[PDB]
Design a protein around this ligand. Structure first.
Ligand SMILES: *[C@@H]1O[C@H](CO)[C@@H](O[C@@H]2O[C@H](CO)[C@@H](O[C@@H]3O[C@H](CO)[C@@H](O)[C@H](O)[C@@H]3O)[C@H](O)[C@H]2NC(C)=O)[C@H](O)[C@H]1NC(C)=O
Ligand SMILES: *[C@@H]1O[C@H](CO)[C@@H](O[C@@H]2O[C@H](CO)[C@@H](O[C@@H]3O[C@H](CO)[C@@H](O)[C@H](O)[C@@H]3O)[C@H](O)[C@H]2NC(C)=O)[C@H](O)[C@H]1NC(C)=O
Ligand SMILES: *[C@@H]1O[C@H](CO)[C@@H](O[C@@H]2O[C@H](CO)[C@@H](O[C@@H]3O[C@H](CO)[C@@H](O)[C@H](O)[C@@H]3O)[C@H](O)[C@H]2NC(C)=O)[C@H](O)[C@H]1NC(C)=O
Ligand SMILES: *[C@@H]1O[C@H](CO)[C@@H](O[C@@H]2O[C@H](CO)[C@@H](O)[C@H](O)[C@H]2NC(C)=O)[C@H](O)[C@H]1NC(C)=O
Ligand SMILES: *[C@@H]1O[C@H](CO)[C@@H](O[C@@H]2O[C@H](CO)[C@@H](O)[C@H](O)[C@H]2NC(C)=O)[C@H](O)[C@H]1NC(C)=O
Ligand SMILES: *[C@@H]1O[C@H](CO)[C@@H](O[C@@H]2O[C@H](CO)[C@@H](O)[C@H](O)[C@H]2NC(C)=O)[C@H](O)[C@H]1NC(C)=O
Ligand SMILES: *[C@@H]1O[C@H](CO)[C@@H](O)[C@H](O)[C@H]1NC(C)=O
Ligand SMILES: *[C@@H]1O[C@H](CO)[C@@H](O)[C@H](O)[C@H]1NC(C)=O
Ligand SMILES: *[C@@H]1O[C@H](CO)[C@@H](O)[C@H](O)[C@H]1NC(C)=O
Ligand SMILES: *[C@@H]1O[C@H](CO)[C@@H](O)[C@H](O)[C@H]1NC(C)=O
Ligand SMILES: *[C@@H]1O[C@H](CO)[C@@H](O)[C@H](O)[C@H]1NC(C)=O
Ligand SMILES: *[C@@H]1O[C@H](CO)[C@@H](O)[C@H](O)[C@H]1NC(C)=O
Ligand SMILES: *[C@@H]1O[C@H](CO)[C@@H](O)[C@H](O)[C@H]1NC(C)=O
Ligand SMILES: *[C@@H]1O[C@H](CO)[C@@H](O)[C@H](O)[C@H]1NC(C)=O
Ligand SMILES: *[C@@H]1O[C@H](CO)[C@@H](O)[C@H](O)[C@H]1NC(C)=O
Ligand SMILES: *[C@@H]1O[C@H](CO)[C@@H](O)[C@H](O)[C@H]1NC(C)=O
Ligand SMILES: *[C@@H]1O[C@H](CO)[C@@H](O)[C@H](O)[C@H]1NC(C)=O
Ligand SMILES: *[C@@H]1O[C@H](CO)[C@@H](O)[C@H](O)[C@H]1NC(C)=O
Lengths: 317, 173, 173, 317, 173, 317
């Protein structure tokens, strides 16, 4: 008689195939997916401070395009730029646009402080029909279009000390009229010139008169420049025409802010990891949703699936 | 795989064992039965949970980075931005692929190990009273009722109690 | 290495075994002979081929990248192009070095494992009819002619047939 | 009597040494090399479309240096530039040469479409003794050297709309004469000026009169610029002298094309992976032939050899 | 862990064994004693030293690189310099973390292995003269004085000398 | 009776906790630290050749600021720039300062060879009260301030062939006076112009007259430029005013040299690995002292500690 005692292990009728060092397909009793492959399709408004640019790029909100007036002085962790965005002020370009966009994005604030520059000798607050605010000819909110006064434009030599304990970011520009006629009509002399300097920098710009392909019926252009001024340093502006003057400075901060291009709607929900496709759960270590991410995110990989065994080899009856 | 129990000398698993990962089936004069072994089951589970603790819910925060999509052709700098990102992604994809292959081989081996440890522990417990049939089963050479089988499972079996009976049966002619 | 058979309790390998990786040598009343074991051999080979399948013939396509040699001194941007490439190459060289060291340790261990599994399987098969001499050999305590040895190799040996004979020889004085 | 049955494993008389986690030198029965360390020394002409630049750099084939006329409108997967290459047309430079070379290389085509620009008022097709084609004074095939007509050079204001569904790549230049005498002789006025604009860009260039060290007896220079024009956008060229005009546009594509510097001969053979040393087999996962590669290639590593064990530990008699 | 000796069937380690990593404790008619086993100790040490040889004193020389701290805000190029460095550091930090976790699991397993090998070697040596008590101890069924114990430790024990005595004691009633 | 023989392993009363694949805290008998976490706080002067900039940046030592005269012609493996450094010569800027600093740092030498340029027609060796050397008005040692001679500044057209077998590095500049009065006083004409060319390059600079915020009472500036001349090539300098002339060339080498910003004192000691915090031992494979390193160094990681088991699991009585 006696007895028999057998040792054994479980099995399941529904095993899962995983890869190992020695075999690309071996069945185990259970596994878990390590690649996040989906989003809910909306960017959750929590816990990061989201700023939806809507019709405005960050640069347009910075300069003060009238449709972006609602953005004044706002802060963000993540600024979201929409593909539908468009400019509706005076046509402009920014040499090294990507760098200005980046540094403002990273700073994470549009906080602006007005300053009383001395523009004695010229006419301030020039407006344009290409930049309508409240049904009237206007201009970028943060810029001051200077023109002749009584058919004179005296050589400007204007100073602004930074006596703060923080850096100042100045945004200014040069106007390129479309014709000599316009140059004279605005600035009362044939050729303008702009030099913006500090103790540690100098930016000299020569206006270029000439027609460009019209944008919203405008053949002229403004080129945008920027200058950072440290505490103890001084902004100096020298111009004999064509200066698009700053009205003050932006505060520049450091921290965790950024900018992302996405058309995903903002949702009332809470998610740490943002991608342009929408927020994604961050439980898994990897993800194949987007190489662009913000926040505590799984790492982007090329694989669509990676299954980690969480059970023994499955050996069915 | 490396110990040779699971998918090895143990012919197959038991789909009917639903309350543990390892266990015992017996036949004696009172019937035939099955019982999960909790300690071996927990040892395997704890190790797998250790891997999971390293991998799940442990992501890294990143904020402002570089651009990764571009609307205009630019040449040298954009080539470099793209190459940096492509390089990064391939290295992470490699890490992820290797991690899964290594961990999975190891998970199969550690679960095989736990099966083997429980088998070896049982074998030693039985001393001279049973013989290894080569398929994970022991032929026990004495009357071993439910309480007796339970003592083996519970690690309280006293081999001396049965030794005379078992030796007489084993070394018979 | 980790099981302790190859370069362990098995004193050395057999250069004269050319038709398999693992096998049996015997001595009996009819002579002395050798036979490869196909199943253990195939198990080791299949696992090594699994590694090869992951590594051989699996390259990644890349096209336009960044420049990596430069005819003029340029400073900042070129420093960055060079550093990106140097960084990449060191990380891949690390991956390659580690991959080989890990895989090789594992290949030595899995081949040791397969030797050990075949030894253990044989030991169980022989039940009470043989004793382990400690060097991979079993002393078989009964007449075991070529057909008998073949039955052990083929996994069809019936230990009960020889048990009385073997016990009488083993437990002699 | 009885019997003995011994378990064992094979060994070989010619084992190979490999490295492991715990030992830098352990002998196994067999191993395989994972680092490709050699090339056959030729770049196989298959399966990628190879274009051997021979005496021509890509930029010279682009501009239309006479010795590169054979390259017109050709496409490639890999353009191969030879160290022996040289220019034999009017001496030129390209600001950000590396970027123009790269974008054209990546586009993978020299397909050029002529366009009928309106150059009324000036003399077209200026030629030079520094750029001989078929024994006669000539010029870059794709560029149009404009000069005065009847000792006048009227202000040019020429437009070219992109009404295609694809982007256009324009190549143009500015001539810097070596003396004032030359400036006047060519352009009938002391100072030229060039502005090339679109709706989204402007490139203004001032000619610089003066001697440079003579190249093939020429002290003057041409500087080459480029402009991409999107569908719906417009090329506008404004010049009062010194314009080296485009004759049309290059198509610009996207795909897998590139460029490589190599002096390896092209062979009639088939190999997926190309390096400057020649094509290399791609069976192994790594290679130490060259960090520069094109195609499905092993990854470059610093090691000259990495041996993967393919057998057990070798324990000889 | 994977063999199940250390922190397994061996209940605990011996703090009083200060001249080796593995060894023997005995009790016989002359007393009770302890002796380190040099070969198993050296095998474990040599393997760990092999890991150390790969990791210690093997650094790579680098010279001029890219800047990694910046006193002015610059945008695109500086974003790229920072991202390249952050990417590199995260990949190296990953390599370092994984290396330590893998090596440590393996060091625990190889040391467990060496304990197991010495146990198995001893078990085979004793043949039919001792039984495995399940806790790393053997009950030896014959008089085995200090010289006798020493012969087992030294691998020169002749099981045949004691076999009659041991079988009589083992298979008693 | 009989005997008992027990197999066992050692344990210690003072085990160490390490991490593994399956457990974040397991005690072993011994471990070793793989992350170097400290420096001795000094940069050892051996075995790399250290050059302490003291009060001088590399660029100031290059140009020849009087307080940096001691640095002439010196070489280094590692140039160490101190945060206390300051300039005390004529105020200057360098477009792409970071690139000039880098290329000179990497070259690893200040070896300078004077050359006899032909400055017939102008006054050489202009000095300034903003750049005192030995109690007298002076200038950068390596630069030659040219001014009018007898109230004329004839158009300079000066050549310098590289007939060496090595490359030459030329450093030169453009002076921007603060007023028209100064421009005329120095250069005897209203507008200067500088063109520096080779066969393979051209650098044209227009002086910008105007006040900048005063530095050490100086409103004017000098902008620094550089030009590399290959063997067989020729430096050509064309100027009609405002040229700050080179006095010769720097040798440019290749090798293992670099530059590091650090305030750690230099010590009389021997250490292969340098960080800004000081030298660090290089026995461990990793370190968390600084991502900036020079020499044979452990790799920087984020972890403050990584313990490698060097013993078995510790299982105390
Ligand atoms: C140089 O050439 C350009 C291109 O021809 C000239 O620009 C063009 O000027 C015309 C005449 O003013 C513009 O016509 C206007 O078009 C708008 C919108 O279609 C229409 O509402 C007006 O009634 C008017 O007809 C035309 O838009 C414009 N084209 C472009 C591409 O900008 C330019 O005037 C020339 N420069 C000089 C100084 O002559
Ligand atoms: C400014 O200085 C440069 C350098 O001296 C002058 O360029 C030189 O001009 C001379 C005279 O025309 C060139 O001579 C020619 O050499 C060729 C080839 O060797 C020879 O075949 C001719 O018969 C003639 O002798 C010389 O090549 C040239 N040197 C360089 C380096 O370009 C330049 O003319 C001066 N600028 C002005 C406006 O005076
Ligand atoms: C354009 O505006 C700037 C800023 O006001 C003018 O610069 C300033 O010029 C004054 C008068 O020469 C300088 O005053 C001097 O200050 C020093 C040191 O404090 C003192 O020792 C002298 O006795 C003298 O008072 C002042 O430093 C200077 N300010 C700055 C910021 O540079 C500049 O002169 C104007 N440009 C023109 C062409 O008028
Ligand atoms: C963003 O711009 C779009 C386009 O101008 C605005 O959509 C318009 O909304 C008005 C008012 O409802 C409609 O009359 C127009 O038909 C819309 N235009 C188009 C083309 O759809 C939209 O309102 C703007 N968004 C915000 C919040 O300012
Ligand atoms: C590339 O340029 C070289 C150099 O001009 C050409 O080689 C010349 O070929 C002609 C005709 O056979 C010979 O007379 C010359 O002696 C060669 N010059 C030298 C310096 O070797 C070559 O033909 C050109 N290749 C192509 C295909 O155009
Ligand atoms: C670096 O510059 C500092 C600052 O000018 C020098 O320190 C001065 O040394 C003199 C002579 O001992 C003292 O009279 C001054 O009081 C110091 N100035 C300050 C602000 O501390 C220092 O000598 C310079 N170092 C070298 C080696 O040139
Ligand atoms: C197997 O099937 C059961 C019943 O649907 C399910 O609950 C279980 O999760 C499955 N196992 C897996 C994870 O594949
Ligand atoms: C499969 O494994 C995961 C992770 O351990 C676990 O969450 C899940 O419950 C498992 N499923 C079963 C049926 O055990
Ligand atoms: C310029 O416009 C601003 C904004 O409306 C206004 O506050 C200010 O009074 C104006 N300044 C002058 C001098 O007109
Ligand atoms: C996210 O968007 C990217 C970019 O458009 C796209 O390639 C990808 O398919 C999307 N992924 C998911 C999961 O939606
Ligand atoms: C060993 O030698 C034989 C005979 O030349 C050869 O065929 C075999 O490939 C060698 N083994 C290796 C791969 O080292
Ligand atoms: C050595 O291993 C490689 C890869 O498995 C194989 O191609 C070759 O035939 C082997 N040589 C021998 C003699 O087995
Ligand atoms: C310019 O030269 C081209 C190319 O030979 C020719 O087709 C065209 O007729 C010429 N145009 C004029 C106006 O001379
Ligand atoms: C390939 O060429 C490179 C660059 O010249 C050289 O360093 C290397 O030695 C070559 N490799 C081989 C295998 O020919
Ligand atoms: C344990 O303590 C002893 C006595 O102080 C010491 O020598 C030994 O290094 C310690 N072990 C470790 C490395 O933790
Ligand atoms: C701990 O391990 C390290 C590295 O092997 C060694 O240098 C040290 O002596 C060890 N300590 C002890 C007490 O063994
Ligand atoms: C210029 O100054 C240098 C340096 O003191 C001197 O050697 C040289 O003679 C001076 N040259 C002239 C022409 O004054
Ligand atoms: C080294 O200096 C860096 C940068 O200032 C600082 O973050 C770090 O704490 C220092 N590390 C040590 C070990 O001193």
């Amino acid at each position: 008689p006696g007895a028999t005692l057998c040792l054994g292990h479980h099995a399941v009728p529904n095993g899962t195939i995983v890869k190992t060092i020695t075999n690309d397909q071996i069945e185990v009793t259970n596994a878990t997916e390590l690649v996040q492959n989906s989003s809910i399709g909306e960017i959750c408004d929590s816990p990061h401070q989201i700023l939806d640019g809507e019709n405005c790029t960050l640069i347009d909100a910075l300069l003060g395009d009238p449709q972006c007036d609602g953005f004044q002085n706002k802060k963000w962790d993540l600024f979201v730029e929409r593909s539908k965005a468009y400019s509706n002020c005076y046509p402009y370009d920014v040499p090294d646009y990507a760098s200005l966009r980046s540094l403002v994005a990273s700073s994470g604030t549009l906080e602006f402080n007005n300053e009383s520059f001395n523009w004695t000798g010229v006419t301030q607050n020039g407006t344009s029909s290409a930049c309508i605010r409240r049904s009237n000819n206007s201009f970028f909110s943060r810029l001051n279009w200077l023109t002749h006064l009584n058919f004179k434009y005296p050589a400007l030599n204007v100073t602004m000390p930074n006596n703060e304990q923080f850096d100042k970011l100045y945004i200014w520009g040069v106007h390129h009229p479309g014709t000599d006629k316009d140059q004279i009509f605005l600035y009362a002399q044939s050729s303008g010139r702009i030099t913006v300097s500090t103790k540690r920098s100098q930016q000299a710009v020569i206006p270029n008169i000439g027609s460009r392909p019209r944008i919203r019926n405008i053949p002229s252009r403004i080129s945008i420049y920027w200058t950072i001024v440290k505490p103890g340093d001084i902004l100096l502006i020298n111009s004999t025409g064509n200066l698009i003057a700053p009205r003050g400075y932006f505060k520049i901060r450091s921290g965790k802010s950024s900018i992302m291009r996405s058309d995903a709607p903002i949702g009332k929900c809470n998610s740490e990891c943002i991608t342009p496709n929408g927020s994604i759960p961050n439980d898994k270590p990897f993800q194949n949703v987007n190489r662009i991410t913000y926040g505590a995110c799984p790492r982007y990989v090329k694989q669509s699936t990676l299954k980690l065994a969480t059970g023994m080899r499955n050996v069915p009856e | 795989g490396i110990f040779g129990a699971i998918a090895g000398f143990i012919e197959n698993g038991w789909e009917g064992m639903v309350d543990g990962w390892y266990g015992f089936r017996h036949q004696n004069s009172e019937g035939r039965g099955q019982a999960a072994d909790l300690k071996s089951t927990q040892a395997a589970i704890d190790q797998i949970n250790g891997k999971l603790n390293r991998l799940i819910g442990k992501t890294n925060e990143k904020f402002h980075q570089i651009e990764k999509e571009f609307s205009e052709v630019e040449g040298r700098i954009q080539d470099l931005e793209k190459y940096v990102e492509d390089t990064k992604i391939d290295l992470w994809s490699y890490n992820a692929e290797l991690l899964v292959a290594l961990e999975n081989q190891h998970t199969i081996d550690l679960t095989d190990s736990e099966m083997n440890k429980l088998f070896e522990k049982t074998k030693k417990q039985l001393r001279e009273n049973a013989e290894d049939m080569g398929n994970g089963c022991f032929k026990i050479y004495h009357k071993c009722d439910n309480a007796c089988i339970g003592s083996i499972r519970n690690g309280t079996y006293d081999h001396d109690v049965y030794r005379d009976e078992a030796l007489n049966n084993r070394f018979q002619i």
